[PDB]
Amino acid sequence: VGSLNCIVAVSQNMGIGKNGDLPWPPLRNEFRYFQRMTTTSSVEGKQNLVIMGKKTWFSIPEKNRPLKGRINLVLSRELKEPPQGAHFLSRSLDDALKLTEQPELANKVDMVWIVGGSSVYKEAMNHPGHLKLFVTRIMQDFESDTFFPEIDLEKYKLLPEYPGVLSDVQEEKGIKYKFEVYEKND
Ligand SMILES: NC(=O)C1=CN([C@@H]2O[C@H](COP(=O)(O)OP(=O)(O)OC[C@H]3O[C@@H](n4cnc5c(N)ncnc54)[C@H](OP(=O)(O)O)[C@@H]3O)[C@@H](O)[C@H]2O)C=CC1
Ligand SMILES: [C]C1=NC([N])=NC([N])=C1[C]C1234B567B89%10B%11%12%13B85%14B%1158B%12%11%15B%139%12B%1061B%12%112C5%153B%14874
């Protein structure tokens, strides 16, 4: 796999989770952005792959698992088989990426999207090669118990814009946020 993508929503104090859920109230269009970005592929015959940790998997409501229209892969060192509803299980990101090139998935996967949590982001962000980070900056502090790792600006560049991503400040339920895209190349 020649490139990876991460996607996250983060508060001002770098929080991504609290008590197994989001630190802020649910933001519908922010969620719809996550859905659009991770689901959309114009390559006929293929789907995108979402990779996530075990806690992130169980944070998704049962009725919404697996994430529709995407191949769902869960990372765990302890499970022997995927959690019920998930399509695949791997012990590591690198193992996950090798799996996509074996016969079952060979001709089936377009984009790869890392969707959390902290440890999966940390690993992905240090993976060699081209990687983009789609980061929604929630422009307030929220009490959090799970945090997004620091973005290394020696490696990552804030892109000034990105096709299909809105540039202006957004607001839903009185909460301001903005969509950012970062990239590294080595
Ligand atoms: N705001 C946002 O964008 C997002 C928020 N969230 C929030 O974050 C929280 C969940 O995230 P977090 O607590 O960080 O947990 P994770 O989703 O990363 O799950 C942790 C578990 O996943 C497995 N795992 C994680 N990383 C790896 C690794 N790279 N290799 C192999 N296995 C791995 C391990 O399972 P095992 O013990 O079985 O080995 C580990 O104990 C929730 O509050 C959720 O709501 C989650 C995603 C994004
Ligand atoms: C709100 C959000 N927004 C962005 N831009 N990126 C994310 N990674 C998330 C966090 C999400 B959503 B969907 B489920 B649902 B649950 B699981 B899956 B995605 B993971 C958590 B919530």
Side-chain angles (χ1 to χ4, degrees), residues 1-27 29-79 81-90 92-107 109-186:
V1 167
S3 187
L4 302 166
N5 309 273
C6 292
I7 188 163
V8 69
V10 304
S11 62
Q12 194 161 29
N13 58 315
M14 301 298 283
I16 64 174
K18 178 65 176 181
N19 295 334
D21 209 334
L22 301 169
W24 44 88
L27 304 175
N29 292 339
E30 209 286 315
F31 172 74
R32 293 176 57 253
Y33 172 81
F34 168 83
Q35 295 280 74
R36 175 171 62 91
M37 300 304 300
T38 59
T39 311
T40 304
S41 172
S42 67
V43 183
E44 194 175 350
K46 309 213 189 199
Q47 295 177 281
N48 295 338
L49 175 70
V50 291
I51 297 178
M52 68 191 86
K54 191 174 70 180
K55 295 188 190 199
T56 294
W57 171 261
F58 287 115
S59 84
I60 311 167
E62 279 202 306
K63 76 199 188 169
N64 296 133
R65 309 198 299 248
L67 294 176
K68 61 182 167 179
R70 290 148 286 184
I71 301 160
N72 288 229
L73 186 156
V74 169
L75 298 182
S76 172
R77 307 184 186 77
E78 289 198 73
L79 296 180
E81 64 188 350
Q84 189 82 343
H87 302 112
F88 297 95
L89 170 72
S90 303
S92 65
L93 179 56
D94 201 61
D95 281 352
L97 302 176
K98 290 178 170 179
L99 196 68
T100 69
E101 314 206 319
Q102 309 314 306
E104 181 167 18
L105 288 178
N107 299 306
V109 181
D110 183 23
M111 302 179 90
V112 184
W113 286 92
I114 306 320
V115 307
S118 315
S119 284
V120 190
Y121 290 135
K122 186 177 175 186
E123 181 153 324
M125 292 171 73
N126 279 314
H127 189 76
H130 181 263
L131 172 54
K132 288 194 276 287
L133 317 178
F134 290 78
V135 181
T136 298
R137 293 292 185 184
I138 302 292
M139 295 155 61
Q140 311 190 184
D141 255 32
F142 283 96
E143 165 63 33
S144 300
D145 61 26
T146 314
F147 295 86
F148 188 66
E150 63 190 352
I151 296 176
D152 183 357
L153 297 173
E154 270 282 70
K155 283 193 168 173
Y156 291 94
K157 184 164 197 160
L158 183 55
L159 296 183
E161 71 193 338
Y162 200 76
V165 179
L166 301 170
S167 294
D168 298 329
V169 173
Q170 308 293 297
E171 186 176 320
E172 294 188 80
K173 312 200 176 285
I175 300 173
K176 287 177 185 64
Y177 63 89
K178 56 192 184 176
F179 300 121
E180 298 186 334
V181 188
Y182 296 78
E183 120 184 323
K184 74 175 181 72
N185 295 297
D186 299 306

